[PDB]
């Protein structure tokens, strides 16, 4: 007769918000095994975001649009600041940021959080554009998600691949799921989520010791960024395609990201050649955006589901009674080009929300 | 001191052109090794198509447009006889077929391969189409696959996980590449093929007894079929999304492909309505397709690629010397919606490739 937890959570998915819900979930003491289809060893799979990211720290809304964005982000910039000296995140000195009128700087609203946030003269800036500098902080993105899972290790959480098509799939051993599947909350019965989108990225990774990060959305017929990233390695940027699926290399976006990479930093080349650009792979990742953006609350849901909860329900149309429990789901989904600057504030709010419904439902 | 194998060949790619290609090689006595991202075990993985075929026979072209197709499938039609007593192809008896018109039945080109072949009556038809009537054979394409995988295995042929990105990296001890890669020939560099082109196919996985088979190409706005498969299990179908790649299930295409499949068949469901079908899965594959055709045929390369062989080469753009080497890359890909239907064929057009190959180049 051994004395077993009654903190049990699962948590389905194991990209960056996985990962970091997962976390700050094992250090609150629960229980936690993740279930996914994609696990951080999974460097080059195109079927989940994180292996793709930059990746840095630059807000993209202001805090009217974004106040939840921005708290994230606050906190999660606090977090990298404390993983610098192990080396887990790099500081990016003297960044520069180009957009294509003041607003597009945000109201500037970060400028306490990045250190050395100051305007810069037009004279440094693309023709034409606006442009601010400061210092903020990137991770190595796989390299990050494989940190988040040793730590993940020596709190008691385990991991097994699975790739769930419904629900009362995940419920398996808890009665609480955080739902953090990306463009997966498509397509799984109870879930359904029709607004889940992917904006497609295309970007190449380059070998240079290049360390200077240049943000530029002053042309909006041209996004281009430089992040440097842990390990001597630039990725170059990029596109935003919304709605677009495609996995394959576009040979003309390789052309025209390093022309403007290269326009906008010589230095990510040996000679300031495109011909001098040490190039290491060429990438396409989709990113998990959400119409609405992204979604962060906890809902009841009953088992089994029925054809009246969800279209692509199994088994017979004909649903009911047998035999009938409620859940909690934790829905963590939807954080597209910003997941994981936001990832760390974003699992801690959803702690917040198990705690509650843990409160609440589950003694 | 030992006498060591001279015909050492990589296949790339493990659908069931590439796993097809390299059992035929083996049983003509060379020695495979077969890199892949996706493996017969990956039996749910969106990254390739083979996991979610019919998997029928059902031309789709006449002789003169299609003479390799017909060709490769009137051999497959042959090698599947031989595997319905061991029971890796199952007889679809009174297959019913419909079109728009006489046009969509292709000449009858095929009427000598599958037995009983006649015309159907109107009355027997969905209204204003016509229709024939025939017996002919389908597989479980997942299983199918990991047969084909145990035939490789007892003929020496050996298995790795890799994801190329340039072909210097399949040239990894062999002199000869067969590049089925499906989809991903567009996007390794040496290939390049921007022919390439998936078309999305979002399907019903049904469990019904149902032993029917009915082909129904005969309303434009609503493609449908229903595929029994070893196993208590239909198919319906479906869609041909050119171009589109979008991995995520439509909850409106799950109703478009029920109530039409349920006009074709009411046994498909245990009361003849919707809501008596059982749904086992969901299911979107992309078939890789190519503009211009499969392609089946043998080309001489040079190691290593530079810029000009290709835009995504690896390293700067300055490139040569380096040290050289002329290879065999034997392509076998862009089989669309007919690749289990003409794997049997095309791998033995592959094989004949390689070797004539290896008398002119390779000793
Ligand atoms: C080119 C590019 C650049 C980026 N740069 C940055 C950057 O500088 N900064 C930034 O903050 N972000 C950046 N991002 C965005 C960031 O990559 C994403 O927002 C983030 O990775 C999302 O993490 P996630 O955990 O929500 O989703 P994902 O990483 O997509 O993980 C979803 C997880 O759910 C699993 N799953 C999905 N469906 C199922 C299922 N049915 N059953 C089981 N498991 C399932 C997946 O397999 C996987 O484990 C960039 C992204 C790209 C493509
Ligand atoms: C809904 C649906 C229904 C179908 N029904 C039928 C049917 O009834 N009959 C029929 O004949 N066909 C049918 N098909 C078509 C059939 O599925 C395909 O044509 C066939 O599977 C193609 O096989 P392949 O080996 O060429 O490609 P794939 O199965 O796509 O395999 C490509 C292989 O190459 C690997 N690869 C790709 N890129 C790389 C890389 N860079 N590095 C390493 N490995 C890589 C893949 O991982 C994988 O091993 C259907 C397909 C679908 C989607």
Redesign the interface.
């Given at each position: 007769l051994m004395m077993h937890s009654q903190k049990r959570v699962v948590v389905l998915g194991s990209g960056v918000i996985g990962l970091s819900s997962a976390l700050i979930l094992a250090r609150k003491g629960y229980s936690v095994h993740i279930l996914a289809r994609d696990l951080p060893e999974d460097v080059?799979?195109?079927?989940f975001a994180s292996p793709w990211a930059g990746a840095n720290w630059t807000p993209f809304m202001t805090l009217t649009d974004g106040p939840r964005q921005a708290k994230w982000e606050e906190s999660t910039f606090k977090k990298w600041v404390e993983l610098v000296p192990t080396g887990h995140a790099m500081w990016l000195k003297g960044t520069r940021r180009f957009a294509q009128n003041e607003d597009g700087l945000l109201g500037h609203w970060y400028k306490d959080i990045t250190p050395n946030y100051r305007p810069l003269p037009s004279s440094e800036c693309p023709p034409g554009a606006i442009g601010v500098t400061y210092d903020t902080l990137s991770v190595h993105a796989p390299k990050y998600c494989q940190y988040l899972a040793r730590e993940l290790q020596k709190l008691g959480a385990t991991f097994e691949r699975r790739?769930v098509?419904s629900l009362e799939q995940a419920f398996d051993g808890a009665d609480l799921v955080v739902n953090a599947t990306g463009?997966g909350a498509?397509?799984i019965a109870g879930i359904?989520d029709?607004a889940?989108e992917p904006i497609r990225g295309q970007t190449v990774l380059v070998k240079s010791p290049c360390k200077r990060c240049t943000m530029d959305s002053s042309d909006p017929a041209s996004p281009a960024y430089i992040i440097p990233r842990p390990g001597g390695e630039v990725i170059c940027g990029g596109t935003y395609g919304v709605g677009?699926?495609?996995?394959?290399?576009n040979?003309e976006t390789?052309?025209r990201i390093l022309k403007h990479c290269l326009r906008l930093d010589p230095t990510i080349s040996?000679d300031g050649?495109?011909?001098?650009?040490?190039?290491?792979?060429?990438n396409?990742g989709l990113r998990p955006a959400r119409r609405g953006g992204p979604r962060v609350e906890a809902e009841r849901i009953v088992l089994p589901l029925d054809?009246t909860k969800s279209?692509?329900?199994?088994?017979?149309?004909?649903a009911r009674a047998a035999k009938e429990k409620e859940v909690t789901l934790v829905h963590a989904y939807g954080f597209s080009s910003a997941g994981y600057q936001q990832s760390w504030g974003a699992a801690e709010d959803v702690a917040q929300l198990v705690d509650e419904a843990f409160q609440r439902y589950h003694g």
């Open positions: 080059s799979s195109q079927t790739t098509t463009l498509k397509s359904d029709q889940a677009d699926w495609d996995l394959s290399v040979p390789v052309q040996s050649t495109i011909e001098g650009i040490e190039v290491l792979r060429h396409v054809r279209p692509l329900s199994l088994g017979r149309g004909s």
